[PDB]
């Protein structure tokens, strides 16, 4: 519950635009629960909003490492790759995610976007 508490605190900070506070909350939760993919996925989002795409990417990778069946982790990873202008890798990441969650609409959209560039 303490982990959920910190995650919620982070989500709230992010909602009021306090991204650094959100990162601190997610990072504290991660220290307590280092295998929680949701925390890395949320922190990846916060880093992407902040504009630190390398860290958004690292957290997206960790999300996929922890929970390979979860499509959203690949979206985190792939979005970071797009920001990093690594589109070939972004496309392969959407494809990799689809090997786990074939009907995921966000991954399908991402793949479509990369195939249309």
């Amino acid at each position: 519950e303490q982990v959920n508490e910190l995650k919620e605190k982070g989500n709230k900070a992010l909602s009021v635009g306090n991204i650094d506070d959100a990162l601190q909350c997610y990072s504290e939760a991660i220290k307590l629960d280092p295998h929680n993919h949701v925390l890395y996925s949320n922190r990846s989002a916060a880093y992407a909003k902040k504009g630190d795409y390398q860290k958004a990417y690292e957290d997206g990778c960790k999300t996929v490492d922890l929970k390979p069946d979860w499509g959203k982790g690949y979206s985190r990873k792939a979005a970071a790759l797009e920001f990093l202008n690594r589109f070939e890798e972004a496309k392969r990441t959407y494809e990799e995610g689809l090997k786990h969650e074939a009907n995921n609409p966000q991954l399908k959209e991402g793949l479509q976007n990369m195939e249309a560039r």
């Binding site: 989500n11 979206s75 797009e82």
Partner: peptide, 8 residues
């Protein structure tokens, strides 16, 4: 630009 999905 890429979409940043909502947090969970």
């Amino acid at each position: 630009g890429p979409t940043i999905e909502e947090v969970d």
